[PDB]
Amino acid sequence: NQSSLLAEFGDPITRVENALQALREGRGVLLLDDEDRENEGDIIYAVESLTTAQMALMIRECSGIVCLCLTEAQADRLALPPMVVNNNSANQTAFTVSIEAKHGVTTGVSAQDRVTTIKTAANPQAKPEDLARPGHVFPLRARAGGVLARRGHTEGTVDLMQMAGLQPAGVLCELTNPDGSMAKTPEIIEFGKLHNMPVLTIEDMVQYRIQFDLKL
Amino acid sequence: SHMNQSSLLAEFGDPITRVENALQALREGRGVLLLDDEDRENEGDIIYAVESLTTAQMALMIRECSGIVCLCLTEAQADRLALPPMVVNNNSANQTAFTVSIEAKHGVTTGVSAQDRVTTIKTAANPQAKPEDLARPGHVFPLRARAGGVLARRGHTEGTVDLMQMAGLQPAGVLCELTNPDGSMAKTPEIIEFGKLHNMPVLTIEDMVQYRIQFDLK
Numbered sequence: 001n002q003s004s005l006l007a008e009f010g011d012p013i014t015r016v017e018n019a020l021q022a023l024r025e026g027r028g029v030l031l032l033d034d035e036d037r038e039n040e041g042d043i044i045y046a047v048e049s050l051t052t053a054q055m056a057l058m059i060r061e062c063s064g065i066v067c068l069c070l071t072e073a074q075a076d077r078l079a080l081p082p083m084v085v086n087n088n089s090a091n092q093t094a095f096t097v098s099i100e101a102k103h104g105v106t107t108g109v110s111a112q113d114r115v116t117t118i119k120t121a122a123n124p125q126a127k128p129e130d131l132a133r134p135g136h137v138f139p140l141r142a143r144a145g146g147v148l149a150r151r152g153h154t155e156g157t158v159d160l161m162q163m164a165g166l167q168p169a170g171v172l173c174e175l176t177n178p179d180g181s182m183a184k185t186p187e188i189i190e191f192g193k194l195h196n197m198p199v200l201t202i203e204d205m206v207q208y209r210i211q212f213d214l215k216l
Numbered sequence: 217s218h219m220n221q222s223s224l225l226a227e228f229g230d231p232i233t234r235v236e237n238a239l240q241a242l243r244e245g246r247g248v249l250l251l252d253d254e255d256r257e258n259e260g261d262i263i264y265a266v267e268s269l270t271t272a273q274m275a276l277m278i279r280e281c282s283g284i285v286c287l288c289l290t291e292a293q294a295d296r297l298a299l300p301p302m303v304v305n306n307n308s309a310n311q312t313a314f315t316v317s318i319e320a321k322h323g324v325t326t327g328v329s330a331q332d333r334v335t336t337i338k339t340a341a342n343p344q345a346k347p348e349d350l351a352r353p354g355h356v357f358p359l360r361a362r363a364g365g366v367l368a369r370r371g372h373t374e375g376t377v378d379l380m381q382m383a384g385l386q387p388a389g390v391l392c393e394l395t396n397p398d399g400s401m402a403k404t405p406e407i408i409e410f411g412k413l414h415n416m417p418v419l420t421i422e423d424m425v426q427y428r429i430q431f432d433l434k
């Protein structure tokens with residue numbers, strides 16, 4: 001039972017509030033989506049405080065397909081169209097064209113290079129010409145309305161940033177077991193305890209937003 | 217004194233021998249580690265043959281490499297799958313030939329597990345595959361190898377397809393950059409140790425070029 005396992009991280013309101021405070025402190029959090037959706041937990045970091053060490057942990061412990069969650073306005077500013085005109089992926093995951101920093105990286109895949117690319121993209125004064133395409137960082141357009149419009153990790157990421165009062169850009173990647181299977185709730189909980197990362201669910205976020213009448 | 221890369225690689229044999237051992241590993245369904253030019257990426261990538269690809273091989277790649285696992289295809293196969301370049305005007309440093317990303321439609325869930333990526337890759341590499349067998353976007357990244365292989369473009373992409381063809385295998389391979397725990401990219405000494413521990417031979421693009429020159433040109 002997921003709610004019973006998660007109980008040690010506090011009740012749902014506490015789980016959200018602890019996640020927001022972690023992010024304000026520059027720490028990562030772990031976000032589980034619905035059991036009947038992906039049933040996956042993603043590491044989430046605020047771009048504002050992103051470090052090479054955080055990126056390195058993500059690469060080593062997750063899928064390695066590290067995504068950059070952006071608002072529609074920031075993706076527009078960067079001139080990042082959807083990768084595909086007609087998306088037919090199972091979840092309609094909103095991949096834009098992939099990106100690299102135009103300057104300041106080599107092959108784009110080291111922890112340092114991915115952070116450079118991500119900081120370059122997230123710069124509120126960025127220009128499209130600041131980014132080469134294609135690249136090794138994968139931006140996602142978060143849906144307007146956040147988790148009340150789409151219950152994906154993309155929306156959970158941007159909603160967490162906004163709720164925490166942070167700049168609305170986050171990085172996201174799926175926690176993966178050494179044998180290649182995807183982490184489920186017990187493994188996610190274990191990882192959170194190891195790395196001082198709050199664990200919460202998308203339903204936690206949805207209930208929180210509903211209760212506190214939160215338009216973002 | 218630090219010996220150069222060619223000297224560190226001597227324990228794998230002379231350049232032609234390094235290629236021959238790589239071909240045989242692939243025929244035996246084992247992986248290889250391919251280094252490109254020192255003044256290019258100076259990176260080593262794990263390569264696996266698609267035709268013997270296993271979940272455990274993919275899991276290793278996800279754990280020990282960048283996790284951005286690519287599928288190297290011939291232009292003919294990418295065309296058969298209707299996989300256009302991701303970007304019309306590619307201005308990436310190496311002009312790496314990313315197509316739009318892909319996912320299998322059947323036999324997978326979220327597409328990112330080791331098993332799921334293998335399923336996608338097997339689906340895509342099938343010589344009778346059709347465009348509709350693949351959803352786009354997805355979590356596997358196909359690359360269009362240049363006609364002529366390493367004699368035309370000195371990328372890991374061409375290295376991968378060349379090795380498959382020279383080994384007499386299905387002309388499609390899996391490719392990912394070896395990465396250190398601290399997030400830096402693996403360099404030659406680490407690549408060599410990884411190869412020895414995992415029974416994967418190590419070779420360079422220049423080895424492959426010399427091999428093709430000595431074995432093909434007349």
Ligand SMILES: O=C(NO)[C@H](O)[C@H](O)COP(=O)(O)O
Pocket residue numbers: 033038042065067091092093152153154155172173174355
């Ligand atoms: O597929 C993914 N990344 O590529 C993950 O699911 C990631 O969390 C983002 O996608 P999502 O918003 O559909 O959950």
Ligand SMILES: O=C(NO)[C@H](O)[C@H](O)COP(=O)(O)O
Pocket residue numbers: 136252257261284286310311312359371372373374391393
């Ligand atoms: O960038 C990469 N993968 O995304 C790797 O370098 C991979 O080897 C393919 O690129 P390359 O053929 O330019 O070397």
Ligand SMILES: [Zn+2]
Pocket residue numbers: 072073076
């Ligand atoms: Zn827009």
Ligand SMILES: [Zn+2]
Pocket residue numbers: 107257310312
């Ligand atoms: Zn590269």
Ligand SMILES: [Zn+2]
Pocket residue numbers: 033038040042152153154
């Ligand atoms: Zn997700």
Ligand SMILES: [Zn+2]
Pocket residue numbers: 232
């Ligand atoms: Zn010989």
Ligand SMILES: [Zn+2]
Pocket residue numbers: 236
């Ligand atoms: Zn010989």
Ligand SMILES: [Zn+2]
Pocket residue numbers: none
């Ligand atoms: Zn011979």
Ligand SMILES: [Zn+2]
Pocket residue numbers: 038091093326
């Ligand atoms: Zn997903």
Ligand SMILES: [Zn+2]
Pocket residue numbers: 252257259261371372373
């Ligand atoms: Zn390469």
Ligand SMILES: [Zn+2]
Pocket residue numbers: 409412413
């Ligand atoms: Zn050893």
Ligand SMILES: [Zn+2]
Pocket residue numbers: 280413414
């Ligand atoms: Zn190992």
Ligand SMILES: [Zn+2]
Pocket residue numbers: 382428431432
């Ligand atoms: Zn030949």
